[model samples]
Target: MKRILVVDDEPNIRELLKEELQEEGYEIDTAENGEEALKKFFSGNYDLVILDIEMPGISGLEVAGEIRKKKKDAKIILLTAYSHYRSDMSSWAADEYVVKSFNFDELKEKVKKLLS
Candidate 1:
């Protein structure tokens, strides 16, 4: 089974992802913030990461950069609710970006393609 790390500050988001991804047969682990997420990232092996851009302490971008330092091929998928801001794809090492509040079908497709 593939392992996925989901990092989000909101409990609802984390729980929702954990349950949904679990149903899809992906082994899921969650962290409430970038700090905790980094600890899990270093401690365990994951096939992909689903990360939120806004969080307390270290931001998602920083988390991605740090993960890249150790695992250059790590697959990162960044999620953000801010659709107004122009996204410069180069700023992050994320393989995918999905704007929140939309149907997650696209996100699922992105993940499937990446992992396949």
Candidate 2:
């Protein structure tokens, strides 16, 4: 089974992804902040990451960058509040990008494509 890390400051979205992805047969772990996310990132292996851009201490791209330091081809899919922000994130890079979603079918599709 694939393992996934989901980092989001919002409990609502984070919980939703955990439940949703788990239903897709992935082992899902949730993190509320960059600190905990990084802790888990190093301690365990994750096949993919669902990272939110609007975070408290560290930006999502920065967290992704740190993960890249550990594994260059970190499969990360960014969740942004709005559009037109990829240029900055290109400084590091994400495997895929999806806008913050209330409807997660698109998110699911993006995840399925990336992981498959």
Candidate 2 lDDT over residue span 1-116, tens digit each = 88888887767766777888788778787788887888888866788887766679988768888877788867888876664446673534667777664787878888888776
Tens digits of per-residue lDDT, candidate 1, 8-116, equal: 8877767876877777778787777788888898867788887776678877777777777789888888775453342766445667777676466766777788897
TM-score of each: 0.87, 0.85
Determine the backbone clash count of candidate 1.
0
**Poorest stretch of ten by lDDT in candidate 1:** 83-92
Q: Once superposed on the true structure, which residue ranges of model 1 sit more than 4 Å away at CA? A: 83-86, 89-92
Shift in Å, residue 72, candidate 1: 1.1
- Residue 1 miss distance in model 1 (angstroms): 1.4
Using TM-score as the measure, the top candidate is 1
Which consecutive 10 residues in model 2 have the weakest lDDT in total?
A: 83-92
**Local distance difference test, each candidate:** 0.75, 0.76
Query: Which residue pairs of candidate 2 clash?
Result: none
